[PDB]
């Protein structure tokens, strides 16, 4: 969306056992709206004036990557319906006024449009566009054989999606390489941090 | 107007702070509960969420004020239709930090005309609170018809000199009777602010500025008070016979009166 | 018309005047000053009168005797030159501001008691001492009118400078005199009135000093406070049977 | 529908429980020229129908006339013992009728109708009478500081023209008026020359008038603020009922003065000398 980003994962990915969903920049009003709809989420990271003071501790990390919200189980279905019927997904004033949120996926779906990443070699090779983890893993797998296990990579990251690495704990037909499935079915080690430099020497990985 | 429509949309989006931290959604509910028709909008929030509107309001107060008032009316009608039906038009007052518009009666030049300013001074005189006419409802006994009419003057926004006040005859010269209980009236008061005596250059007389208060802004301060008025700065054209001297006087419409000493 | 020729001559004076000798170097004096003042935010210049005489004696002689129209043409020429010198202005400042021209000269000053009635509508230079001042009011320059009945609009009307008004039209082009001034569609400038008193030595024996009303506009406001000795350069003009009040439109002040 | 309102007022007037017909007896007295001031109390209306009470409280200008007309209609059916008076107006009317054989309701009217504030209504200070109570019914209290002498005020004018015999009428519903100059009678219009009619003071209608200023109690006034005043117009039997220096509580109508910004005055309806 133009304010927040969500990531739905299947059952088994990232060490989980049920379908999950992660919303990084959540606000107090949006969370309260979620509570009044049956969603059971869990953030892992004047008397009315006194109530505002209590909310001040709650409203400190809003609009910041520390307000990540994790939804699990069958609540993802109600989350989907709520997001479809929400009134703040589409901006009503500004440059992105009326534009619906963008959907990204590694496999085809109803209404999808096949796209391609731009590759250009200068030795160096440059690839631009929305890079998803399976694309990066496949690229590394190819370059390992092509470059005889010797290359270095510089990764530029989209900051508002770095908190998705927060730990949360039969995929043969998902349409992914078995090595990629094995890699993605691990436990998230990084926290609020993303890879910035990857180096491979003599078929050994030393990430920075 | 397309620009006015865009301003109205953006202001209505700003006011409906529901799925965000519920500040100005709670404020509107509080205003409705307390039976008021003026909302004090801090423009620090507007600048934080939409800087272009904040600057445009600081430099062109008239159209932006009209758009903001209409957006507030729409939001109130959304919250409660009957309350919106009670009041013809809602008012908006501003506060916060203005920047280079924080002036005094001495530094209030003629280049600030039409700009939302915030004047600091000490009151010197206040007039009496006399009523003013906005809408009059007439009735014709012969035809059993109820007539209505709207008035305006030059000392209000959307200024227009309106004549033929209190009509007495219909189209066919039928007698007309005015129903005073059905007409709408509002208060009116005139004040004067003076530059602080401690910050006035020696020898020269202190400067002054005349302000206009209306509705709930009347009887908010007395002579001898340190105040801080916020409102639009405008000229009053003067016409004598068929001639205009060209030396118009300046007035300061007010939308928020705040004391300092308290 | 001759007005266009006069304006072109004033523009040429502004663009081509130079000071210095070829032994050291030449520097354009008024174009550089115009650029510097416009960039600084001060929209005014101080044009001497001997320089204009040296460039074109006829042009100087038409300013000492018919100051109104020639000063207006000089101000328009200054605005055009200032617009062309800083042509690529930053975003938001495309519109060109109006320039005010102030005059100065080294002539011997006159006296208040020497102002005859022949020297009406002529540039004069009178010393004195300021004894009074008024609050800075507002004076309109551009006005727009609108009919009360048919709401026809006649905008961009110009009002002459000084204590002079504008007779409003009678026919609507809707009763007689249906036009009212739109409040927000008016451009105004600063406005002040002073009182100049004859110097303490020029006063004859056994007689009280005489006075004279002054008029100040735009950047000339709030420059002199009561009790200052000044030398005033201005236009003698008029504001019993046939008696008319006379004031002095000030176009230059030299505080002593 | 104002006709329905008038019928409801008549229905209330004829039948009043107490079933002592206070209104009926008083109207009979008025028809007998035994009473002039009739004070309708709003609590009885609240006993019957509070909607009419609210409606009359919102606009006490039309319903006063409605009550007056209802009383005027009910008057003829109570004149039992004819009349025992010697009114100059009645003598003038009688002689004019005798010449006629050979009329506005206000002209043929001598009863003044006033309302009483319901017990629910509460007294208000002078400062508390804002612009939102214009045309409503209010109850102010304060100290009278000045009273003027009673003077006659023209209500309806009665002109006569020499050319014709039809007397002209000119109601006066404004503080100022211009006297008629040319006679508009159809007899003069037929002559193509309007007669120079003159007003006959004998046949005109005059009412007692009094003006007084009411101030604010010093204790109620805030220490910093100065006391404020108010002008009250008193007409009819309510005249000569107050003197300067008396604490009073006045129930009346808040109205503007016309002659967009206007002054205000109070049309008194019931004056009580509280303490
Ligand atoms: Zn017209
Ligand atoms: Zn006649």
Author numbering:
A (entry chain R): 291 to 335, 395 to 471, 485 to 531, 541 to 579
B (entry chain B): 9 to 270
C (entry chain D): 27 to 199, 208 to 273, 287 to 303
D (entry chain F): 4 to 21, 28 to 111, 125 to 281, 291 to 306
Paper excerpt:
Activation requires the recruitment of a set of firing factors, including GINS and Cdc45 that bind MCM to assemble the functional form of the helicase, named CMG (Cdc45-MCM-GINS). Metazoan Downstream neighbor of Son (DONSON) has recently been shown to deliver GINS to MCM during CMG assembly. Here, we used cryoelectron microscopy (cryo-EM) on proteins isolated from replicating Xenopus egg extracts to identify a double CMG complex bridged by a DONSON dimer.
The structure of dCMG contained 2-fold symmetry across the dimerizing N-terminal domain and was refined to 3.1 Å average resolution. Although no DNA was found in the complex, an extensive globular density feature, resolved to 2.7 Å, could be recognized straddling across two CMG assemblies. Within each CMG assembly, this density bridges between Mcm3 and GINS. We named this 24-mer complex dCMGDo (for double CMG-DONSON) and subjected the complete atomic structure to real space refinement. A second interaction involves the N-terminal A-domain of Mcm3, at a site proximal to that engaged by GINS subunit Psf3 in the CMG. As a result, the Mcm7 side of one hexamer swings out causing the two MCM rings to become misaligned, to the point that the two central channels are no longer co-axial and rather identify topologically separate entities.
